[PDB]
């Protein structure tokens, strides 16, 4: 849809949309930028992620509200119908993001910071699909999330220091995957603890600014561990 706008104009308008809290617009602008076919810079990857995280976040929150009303009702068809409507739109956004990652962001990503970033995103959007899935479909979706997170983890441990914020955010999200998608709370706790401890020992290498970036995400690991133990 954005084929007629310059790549640089799409990125500029994504930043404007962010300032205006117009995240559906922001996501459409960044989808257009991706579809230009060039690789994305670090800033551009983060614009892409922020845009779709905001869009899918609203959908997830709405789906949970409606699912809760529906479950209570099952303790007319309208609640189920409308939950299904939101669910289908949520699945559509996840499919769009996964489509961008498959065509062709991941295959052109060779540096660890880009490849880990995109594989983490792939795990995340399969995880959001898993939150609303059932049955055998759910098992295959969960396996897809796990496989993406695991490839990202393997690269991040080989190629990034333990305080790298991308590596930290990946570990955070993979631990939440374990806790509440994979029903593996012990794996979740182990991963969060080990990640936190190995990052602690590497903080001595960091500048003041990098220290703030890394400790911010470490606090999220701690927040979860506090709820989990």
């Amino acid at each position: 849809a954005m084929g007629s706008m310059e790549r640089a104009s799409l990125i500029q308008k994504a930043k404007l949309a962010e300032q205006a809290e117009r995240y559906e617009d922001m996501a459409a602008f960044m989808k257009g930028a991706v579809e230009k076919g060039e690789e994305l810079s670090c800033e551009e990857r983060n614009l892409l992620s922020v845009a779709y995280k905001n869009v899918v976040g609203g959908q997830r929150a709405a789906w949970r509200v409606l699912s809760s009303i529906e479950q209570k009702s099952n303790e007319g068809p309208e609640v189920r119908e409308y939950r299904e409507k939101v669910e289908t739109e949520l699945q559509g956004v996840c499919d769009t993001v996964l489509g961008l990652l498959d065509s062709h962001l991941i295959k052109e990503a060779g540096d660890a910071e880009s490849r880990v970033f995109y594989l983490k995103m792939k795990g995340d959007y399969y995880r959001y699909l898993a939150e609303v899935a059932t049955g055998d479909d759910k098992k295959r979706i969960i396996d897809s999330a796990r496989s993406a997170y695991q490839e990202a983890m393997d690269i991040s441990k080989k190629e990034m220091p333990p305080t790298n914020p991308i590596r930290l955010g990946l570990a955070l999200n993979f631990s939440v995957f374990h806790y509440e998608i994979a029903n593996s709370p012990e794996e979740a706790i182990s991963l969060a603890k080990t990640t936190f401890d190995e990052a602690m020992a590497d903080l001595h290498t960091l500048s003041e600014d990098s220290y703030k970036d890394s400790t911010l995400i470490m606090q999220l690991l701690r927040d979860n561990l506090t709820l989990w133990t």
């Binding site: 922020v50 899918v56 929150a61 939440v176 806790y179 509440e180 709820l227």
Partner: peptide, 12 residues
């Protein structure tokens, strides 16, 4: 639902 901390915007 109690949502645990994950990376990036807390948009839900």
């Amino acid at each position: 639902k109690l949502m645990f901390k994950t990376e990036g915007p807390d948009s839900d």
